[PDB]
Ligand binder design. Structure first.
Ligand SMILES: [Mg+2]
Ligand SMILES: [Mg+2]
Ligand SMILES: [Mg+2]
Ligand SMILES: [Mg+2]
Ligand SMILES: [Mg+2]
Ligand SMILES: [Mg+2]
Ligand SMILES: [Mg+2]
Ligand SMILES: [Mg+2]
Ligand SMILES: [Mg+2]
Ligand SMILES: [Mg+2]
Ligand SMILES: [Mg+2]
Ligand SMILES: [Mg+2]
Ligand SMILES: [Mg+2]
Ligand SMILES: [Mg+2]
Ligand SMILES: [Mg+2]
Ligand SMILES: [Mg+2]
Ligand SMILES: [Mg+2]
Ligand SMILES: [Mg+2]
Ligand SMILES: [Mg+2]
Ligand SMILES: [Mg+2]
Ligand SMILES: [Mg+2]
Ligand SMILES: [Mg+2]
Ligand SMILES: [Mg+2]
Ligand SMILES: [Mg+2]
Ligand SMILES: [Mg+2]
Lengths: 206, 100, 83, 127, 98, 152
RNA sequence: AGAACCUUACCUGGUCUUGACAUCCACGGAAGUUUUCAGAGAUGAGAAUGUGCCUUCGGGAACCGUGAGACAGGUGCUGCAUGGCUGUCGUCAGCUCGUGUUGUGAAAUGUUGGGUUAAGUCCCGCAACGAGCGCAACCCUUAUCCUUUGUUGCCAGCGGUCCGGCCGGGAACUCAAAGGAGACUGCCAGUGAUAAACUGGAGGAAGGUGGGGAUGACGUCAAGUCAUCAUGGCCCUUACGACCAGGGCUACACACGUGCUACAAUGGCGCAUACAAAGAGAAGCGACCUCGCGAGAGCAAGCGGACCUCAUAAAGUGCGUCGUAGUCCGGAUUGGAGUCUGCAACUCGACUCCAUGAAGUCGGAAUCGCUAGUAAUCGUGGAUCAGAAUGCCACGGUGAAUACGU
């Protein structure tokens, strides 16, 4: 059968939203449209910066964007010569003045998005999927994670028939609401087609 | 959808908001009860002159991302599929699964 | 249907063509694609070829036809029977 | 002094005041017979005060809101029983044994997606 | 006399905002009435979860809006000036009327 | 059911007679959830019958009730394609239920002008063994009489 | 979750070729505002006008036209090349792993046995010892009480009244929305293997999972979707790409699925009068007053809302009539006269008035849903939406019969 989104079912319990502004009906569609464009752009340039999440907030007639990254030095640039240009382009796109903050991600091997992106890159570079999946599981578990599950599906190895394979260690109780689960996905465009990757990481009870 | 449909929608919006005021004044003239039927006839003949695409009724709601013309929701500006996709990632503020 | 306070409906180009034809004698039949246009008493005695979707059907306006629309005299479906 | 009571039933809420008196019953600034044309509602209202037999020895001032007819009558029962408890405690076991004290928690079930009603299903055919 | 209305999607944030507003207003010297909770608004949506057919499979979502009212009586010229400069947290819609 | 968990539900007495059995009769006669109509109809019919008899509503209803209620019925039991018609007793509550149901169904099929008149005429007839309800009871008794060879 | 034009992907006709939609180079360049002729329109030609804005006066360029190709474009094929998403078995109680042991081996044990539960739920014994995904708990709503605040919500005790909580007033009460208590086989009795548990009783708003929702294990059906989107391979490039008008998707000897309205007296009609819940509102909802029999029209307050509008709830009740008739049941079809939305109601919209008054008297062989505030029946709101619900999604009123048993 099908499973519920691990993020969606815990938004009122343990997980917070990625957008934290208020608006009436007349502003709502425009706000989502601008947020979509901003996130797409920052994803476009900052690909080699290992950015996990982009939080967008709208205090009053302005905007504040906080990006979480594992390589803050390359994002910042030289004494801030890049944050200002990114700020100016975001201000151009959104139509309001902007301010940008950088948050460092300690232990980047415990973030599901980063692991998914790493696995995708390795698959693109022609690496055997079992090798990469086992490395991901070992790296996550050595840093104190309570559990990790990694699933890869698609036309594996260039075969004529697609299939799905997954590995798991620890506890991953998806039916427990209060539990802290980070779940995220990625796609790889190999010479034979697309390969999908999903990662679940279980951290703590409350 | 096709790029042609998106171009057509953009052009229709442009023509509509370009001719809004003139359409308003001619329609106001026609809708009046205290007037001259000759003036009403002239106004009717003039209203047909404008391009058909200037009518607001010629525009179809579509998803801001994909262009799907079915399943629209006015509150968000997206169809059902994209609403669910975005809402499951916490990108729509205050929205969550309901149960009562 | 059409509200009384608004009068009838006619197309400007069709009206122009009709007047130019009437003032200059009974000329050739007039091709037209306008089917939403009502029939005026000035049209009596004329021959108008109305589009039906694929071709132009000739209609000879008489005094009985005043009031309706042109498209009423150009069927758009072809049906002979079943079996 | 007035003895107070509150009753709830279905979607109706009622408030009741009881004092010494000669038997007057007022509901929403109207008499008992004026408010309820149905007889069952009348026996429903009068059951508690008849079980303990202080009909003409008390005066009742009641108001109601929401719901229909039987729901309002049940709310009136609940309120009058609670007020009688607040006026005398030696009667509690007597009214509990008659079921007057339990609050009826039956609500209406919501409509569910895919069904015509709360439980009725659409017509199913094998082929 | 001042009416203040606060709207928010979350109740914890708006409660903290109301607390800081009322404490700031009271430290100036004016008197306060509230906070009064107005009815919460619930907006519901129902959508299909399948790209093609399968009519009976749907999801249902809800948005809640919390709203509260605070009244300021005997305001001082310092009270209002401290009121604008409070810089309430983002995500709370504030309406002030006199 | 397989579980055997149910109990029994409480029934309210009738408005102006203080009887549960009349309330059950009203419920049996009710359609679409319109109880007031059914209770008015039954009250009118009972009043008319009491006037035309003189005893009361209560024991007149009772007397009609002993004349229609059954005492033994049949149940099917498949063996090898055909069925045994085994006779079994009826509990008193089921006796009352069957009596009332037969009475109501017989009264619904008549050609009078009003349902109250229909019910009054039928129940007065049944008070002394002339209606269709007593005929149905006699047929049930006869059918149960024939197949007593399988009554263990 | 709503085909007159548009949507539109299909048909006929008239037109385009670096192009309806992006980037690169060369050249004439404001952006726009009224205009006229020909044409079904696409388009072609023409007439006045602002021709700037930071600017090292070199201009960079929001953005218009021309010339080439590198390219753009495809709702074209393959769901049996794929990602993502969904249906179903099935909310069924199952599905595995590490180490040890047994077997030449596929494999087995654990997961079997006695009780017990809704449950691989729990207790005891056991060549097994432990662990994971499932079950249950954490989440939302309803039923009882407690504390804080009282406006636009409330009116028990007082003063006035135009009888209007209308005013002065009060924070008791309904109610609103934040935070707590509460239900745990907790206590009593009996059985039981002193265990797990089972039958009953007390208190309580609620008793043994109190009611309802969310939550769908490993997998099966080469199940559905290349037309939401994304994507390998194949295919077209003055056309399988692009623009416009008109038509079609609404046909009609027939067959089936899902519905609505009936065939009446537990009813039809007329007059008078009670009692809800939930929800929406700025290119919007629209009162009051006047005109019209009517759909509606004119003028026009209030509202971004516990305040204003939508917006008199219906079945019910009392009185009168009809008295079993294809009817004072039923409302299909058809003729005449209109209203409103919209450039435009012929094909092909909804609604109003007058006239007409079809089949239908409970439905063959067969077949469906439902265990309680349920079935049955009566009204109200919302999304889509210029206009267009008997469908879909929600909300309350009245309120049953039966379950011996497997
Ligand atoms: Mg495209
Ligand atoms: Mg439209
Ligand atoms: Mg509202
Ligand atoms: Mg069309
Ligand atoms: Mg698939
Ligand atoms: Mg061995
Ligand atoms: Mg097993
Ligand atoms: Mg085994
Ligand atoms: Mg064994
Ligand atoms: Mg066992
Ligand atoms: Mg278990
Ligand atoms: Mg569970
Ligand atoms: Mg008890
Ligand atoms: Mg008990
Ligand atoms: Mg297939
Ligand atoms: Mg498939
Ligand atoms: Mg197929
Ligand atoms: Mg296809
Ligand atoms: Mg067309
Ligand atoms: Mg169709
Ligand atoms: Mg009639
Ligand atoms: Mg008849
Ligand atoms: Mg008529
Ligand atoms: Mg059941
Ligand atoms: Mg209902």
């Amino acid at each position: 059968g099908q499973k519920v989104h691990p993020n969606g079912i815990r938004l009122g319990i343990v997980k917070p939203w990625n957008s934290t502004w208020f608006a009436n009906t007349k502003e709502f569609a425009d706000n989502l449209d601008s947020d979509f464009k901003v996130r797409q752009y920052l994803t476009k340039e900052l690909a080699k910066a290992s950015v996990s999440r982009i939080v967008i907030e709208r205090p009053a007639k302005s905007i504040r964007v906080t990006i979480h990254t594992a390589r803050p030095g390359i994002v910042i640039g030289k004494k801030g010569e890049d944050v200002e240009k990114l700020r100016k382009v975001v201000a151009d796109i959104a139509g309001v003045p902007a301010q940008i903050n950088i948050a460092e991600v300690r232990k980047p091997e415990l973030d599901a998005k980063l692991v998914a992106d790493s696995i995708t890159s390795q698959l693109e570079r022609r690496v055997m999927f079992r090798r990469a999946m086992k490395r991901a599981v070992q790296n996550a578990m050595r840093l104190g994670a309570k559990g990790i599950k990694v699933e890869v599906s698609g036309r594996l190895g260039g075969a004529e028939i697609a299939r799905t394979e997954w590995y798991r260690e620890g506890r991953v109780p998806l039916h427990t609401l209060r539990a802290d689960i980070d779940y995220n996905t990625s796609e790889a465009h190999t010479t034979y087609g697309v390969i999908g990757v999903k990662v679940w990481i279980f951290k703590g009870e409350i | 959808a096709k790029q042609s449909m998106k171009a057509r929608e953009v052009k229709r919006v442009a023509l509509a908001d370009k001719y809004f005021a003139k359409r308003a004044e001619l329609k106001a003239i026609i809708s009046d009860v205290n007037a001259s039927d000759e003036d009403r006839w002239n106004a009717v003949l003039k209203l047909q002159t404008l391009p058909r695409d200037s009518s607001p009724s010629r525009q179809r709601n579509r998803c801001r991302q994909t262009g799907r013309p079915h399943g629209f929701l006015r509150k968000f500006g997206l169809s059902r599929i994209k609403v669910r996709e975005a809402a499951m990632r916490g990108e729509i503020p205050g929205l969550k699964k309901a149960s009562w | 249907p059409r509200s009384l306070k608004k009068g009838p409906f006619i197309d400007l180009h069709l009206l122009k063509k009709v007047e130019k034809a009437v003032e200059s004698g009974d000329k050739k039949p007039l091709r037209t694609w306008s089917r939403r246009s009502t029939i005026f008493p000035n049209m009596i005695g004329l021959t108008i070829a109305v589009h039906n979707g694929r071709q132009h059907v000739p209609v000879f306006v008489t005094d009985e036809m005043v009031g309706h629309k042109l498209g009423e005299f150009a069927p758009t479906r072809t049906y002979r029977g079943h079996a | 002094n007035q003895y107070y009571g509150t009753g709830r039933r279905k979607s109706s809420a009622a408030r009741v005041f009881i004092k010494p008196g000669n038997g007057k019953i007022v509901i929403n600034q109207r008499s008992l017979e004026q408010y309820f044309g149905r007889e069952t509602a009348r026996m429903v209202v009068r059951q508690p005060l008849e079980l303990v037999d202080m009909v003409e020895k008390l005066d009742l001032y009641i108001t109601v809101k929401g719901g229909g007819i039987s729901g309002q009558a049940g709310a009136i029962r609940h309120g009058i029983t609670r007020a009688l408890m607040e006026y005398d405690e030696s009667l509690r076991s007597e009214l509990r044994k008659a079921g007057f004290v339990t609050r009826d928690a039956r609500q209406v079930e919501r409509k569910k997606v895919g069904l015509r009603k709360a439980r009725r299903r659409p017509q199913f055919s094998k082929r | 006399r001042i009416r203040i209305r606060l709207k928010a999607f979350d109740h914890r944030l708006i409660d903290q905002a109301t607390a800081e507003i009322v404490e700031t207003a009271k430290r100036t010297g004016a008197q306060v009435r509230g906070p009064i909770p107005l009815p919460t608004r619930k907006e519901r949506f129902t959508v299909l979860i399948s790209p093609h057919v399968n009519k009976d499979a749907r999801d249902q979502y809800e948005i809640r809006t919390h709203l509260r009212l605070v009244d300021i009586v005997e305001p001082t010229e310092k009270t209002v000036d401290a009121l604008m400069r409070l810089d309430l947290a983002a995500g709370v819609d504030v309406q002030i009327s006199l | 059911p397989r579980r055997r968990v149910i109990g029994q539900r409480k029934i309210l007495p009738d408005p102006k007679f203080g009887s549960e059995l009349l309330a059950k009769f009203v419920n049996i006669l009710m359609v679409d959830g319109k109880k007031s109509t059914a209770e008015s109809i039954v009250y009118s019919a009972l009043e008319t019958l009491a006037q035309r008899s003189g005893k009361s509503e209560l024991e007149a209803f009772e007397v009609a009730l002993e004349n229609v209620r059954p005492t033994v019925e049949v149940k099917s039991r498949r063996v090898g394609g055909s069925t045994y018609q085994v006779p079994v007793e009826v509990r008193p509550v089921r006796r009352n239920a069957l009596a009332m149901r037969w009475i109501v169904e017989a009264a619904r099929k008549r050609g009078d002008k009003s349902m109250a008149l229909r019910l009054a005429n039928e129940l007065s007839d049944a008070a002394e063994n002339k209606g269709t309800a007593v005929k149905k009871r006699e047929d049930v008794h006869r059918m149960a009489e024939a197949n007593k060879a399988f009554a263990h």
